[PDB]
Design an enzyme around this catalytic site. Structure first.
Site, mmCIF file in Angstrom:
data_model
loop_
_atom_site.group_PDB
_atom_site.id
_atom_site.type_symbol
_atom_site.label_atom_id
_atom_site.label_comp_id
_atom_site.label_asym_id
_atom_site.label_seq_id
_atom_site.Cartn_x
_atom_site.Cartn_y
_atom_site.Cartn_z
ATOM 1 N N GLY A 93 -6.702 -4.280 1.505
ATOM 2 C CA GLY A 93 -6.118 -5.010 3.037
ATOM 3 C C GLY A 93 -7.525 -5.922 3.079
ATOM 4 C CE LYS B 79 -4.245 -1.316 2.349
ATOM 5 N NZ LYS B 79 -4.915 -1.104 1.156
HETATM 6 O O1 VO4 Z 1 -7.680 -1.189 2.102
HETATM 7 V V1 VO4 Z 1 -9.535 -1.584 2.025
HETATM 8 O O2 VO4 Z 1 -9.448 -2.289 3.952
HETATM 9 O O3 VO4 Z 1 -10.280 -0.441 2.297
HETATM 10 O O4 VO4 Z 1 -10.355 -2.920 1.668
#
Ligand code: VO4
Length: 574
Positions: A400, A350
């Site tokens: 996530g 990320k």
């Molecule tokens: O990163 V997400 O938890 O918003 O699916």
């Protein structure tokens, strides 16, 4: 101190007569309570780490006393390295008490007010009320434990010794720090979301009634790259997302993703939203976006795994069966450790890419015929508050939820293959479950019309109650899939954040453009037909890599399982 009235959990009361499930439940209760009070270990990645640590401690305490035959303890009593050295039983032989000591010590070390000096920065923003509420949970759990808790026994003392080793080894005190991080604006770049550009929080958590100060949250920007991994045996990487680096030329995929984002993830009333009422429900079902009385995704994933564990148990007695105790201790250690490492690698990727969220991507697109400078997403639900939906404070790629789900459910699939049915490991299983209720849609939780009141049960507070939806699923393959696409329905993730669009959507004659039905809604492939096979390139590395969260989680679970739940070699830790 006025204890917060917690709503009833939709689950058979018998589950908690088994002491392994009971201690998992205490862990889930602390998860929902810290998120209601703003205590320690909040957020998706660290909340997963808490459960991974709890279950490793439980696992090694139980199996030290009741030695297994197919595998061994995570740590060993004979290692040379003192840090990875498991304590020896020496006569202690009450597994129930050993598990109680391990669970209680680990949870106390994790949720206690840092008396060990290390409080500044790491937790210098948590009120005393928060610690007190979590303490009440820990205190009453001792009294509700099936079979009671004997703090004076040797087995209990042994378990405590077990938790100490794991706590010292894997606790990451400054895991979520953001000090020093600042976004770098530009196309495809993550930045504060436009509906919550800044939040005002107390200057002193102990006086929640002003003065307040402006705060911009960036969730755990350095964690994934610096933290200790649990059981992975290598580093995991994903392909560059569409629009960036080696895939910057993938513009038809990107443009179509923008199209799908608007149609499937917009606010309910927009004329441009094509998502159906059922799809909206699938979106909210999997949320658990750190809300009051609800907590984070790892909590929900465990709620589902408890049901699976009990539905497929080998023996009918949940209270006194070493076979059930052993099965559950092993399963939860595998699942929660996989959940922890998925949280680490999804967070590392990320923040490596810093890919922007769909809200900003659509609004800031810049092209008159592609973007919508005024678009609004359905959003992550702020359940049990009177706040508006939001965009999680962290980059989009990969999701996530999708990574956690791929790991948790691929682990369940590897663990039960040949026991519940038989399938190739990369194909659909038959692990069905029914009567599964999400707390986001249970006929109890709601969207309040005034601030949440922590002294009153949620039922006595005005708001719009969330419809109660009882679900049944045919496989863990379906669970994994729906969990991932739910984020597309909320509009908080791009399609490629979940998996390669080619693996989950229906193709048309146009490359990178997918099918839509009559009302312009995106058409997904039948779950039974989905295979996560499309991979892509990385600018900094040779080879093909998985695209999106699901495939990443899948690979993390396979690695861990294949190596039999073994610590990450100290050599390859950051
Ligand atoms: O990163 V997400 O938890 O918003 O699916």
């Amino acid at each position: 101190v006025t204890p917060i009235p917690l709503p009833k959990i939709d689950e058979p009361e018998e589950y908690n007569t088994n002491y392994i499930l009971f201690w998992n439940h205490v862990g889930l209760e602390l998860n929902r309570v810290t998120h209601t009070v703003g205590g320690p270990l909040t957020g998706p990645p660290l909340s997963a780490r808490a459960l991974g640590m709890l279950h490793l401690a439980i696992h090694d305490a139980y199996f030290s006393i009741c030695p297994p035959t197919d595998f061994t303890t995570f740590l060993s009593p004979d290692t040379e390295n003192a840090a990875y050295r498991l304590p020896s039983p020496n006569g202690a032989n009450d597994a129930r008490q050993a598990v109680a000591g391990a669970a209680l010590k680990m949870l106390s070390s994790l949720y206690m007010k840092p008396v060990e000096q290390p409080n500044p920065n790491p937790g210098a923003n948590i009120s005393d009320n928060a610690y007190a509420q979590l303490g009440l949970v820990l205190d009453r759990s001792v009294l509700e434990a099936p079979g009671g808790v004997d703090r004076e026994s040797a087995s209990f003392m042994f378990g405590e010794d077990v938790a100490d080793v794991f706590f010292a080894l894997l606790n990451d005190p400054r895991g979520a720090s953001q000090e020093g991080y600042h976004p770098t604006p530009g196309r495809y770049k993550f930045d504060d979301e436009p509906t919550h550009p800044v939040v005002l929080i107390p200057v002193d958590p102990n006086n929640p009634n002003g003065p307040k100060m402006p705060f911009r949250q960036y969730h755990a920007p350095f964690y994934g790259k610096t933290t200790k991994r649990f059981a992975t045996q290598s580093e995991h990487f994903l392909a560059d997302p569409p629009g960036l680096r080696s895939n910057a030329d993938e513009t038809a995929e990107y443009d179509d993703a923008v199209r799908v984002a608007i149609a499937m993830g917009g606010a309910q009333a927009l004329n441009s939203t094509k998502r159906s009422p059922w799809q909206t429900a699938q979106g909210l079902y999997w949320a658990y976006d750190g809300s009051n009385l609800i907590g984070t995704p790892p909590r929900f994933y465990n709620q589902i795994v408890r049901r699976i564990a009990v539905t497929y148990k080998k023996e009918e007695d949940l209270a006194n069966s070493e076979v059930n105790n052993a099965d559950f201790a092993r399963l939860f250690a595998l699942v929660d450790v996989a959940c922890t490492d998925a949280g680490i690698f999804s967070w590392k990727e990320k923040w490596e890419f810093e890919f922007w969220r769909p809200l900003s991507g659509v609004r800031d697109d810049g092209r008159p015929d592609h973007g919508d400078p005024f678009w609004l997403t359905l959003g992550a639900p702020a359940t049990n508050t009177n706040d508006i939906p939001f965009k999680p404070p962290f980059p989009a790629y990969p999701s996530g939820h999708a990574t956690f789900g791929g790991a948790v459910f691929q682990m369940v699939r590897r663990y039960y293959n040949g026991r519940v049915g038989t399938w190739k490991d990369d194909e659909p299983d038959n692990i069905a479950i029914d009567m599964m209720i999400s707390e986001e849609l249970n006929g109890v939780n709601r969207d309040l019309r005034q601030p949440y009141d922590p002294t009153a049960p949620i039922e006595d507070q005005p708001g719009i109650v969330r419809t109660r939806i009882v679900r049944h699923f045919d496989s863990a393959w379906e669970l994994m899939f729906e969990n991932a696409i739910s984020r597309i329905f909320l509009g908080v993730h791009w399609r490629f954040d979940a998996a390669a669009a080619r693996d989950i959507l229906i193709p048309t004659t146009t490359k990178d453009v997918y099918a839509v039905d009559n009302n312009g809604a995106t058409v997904f492939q039948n779950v039974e037909d989905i295979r996560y096979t499309t991979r892509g390139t990385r600018e900094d590395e040779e080879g093909l890599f998985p695209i999106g969260g699901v495939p990443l989680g899948i690979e993390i679970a396979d690695e861990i399982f294949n190596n039999g739940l073994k610590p990450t070699p100290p050599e390859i830790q950051p």
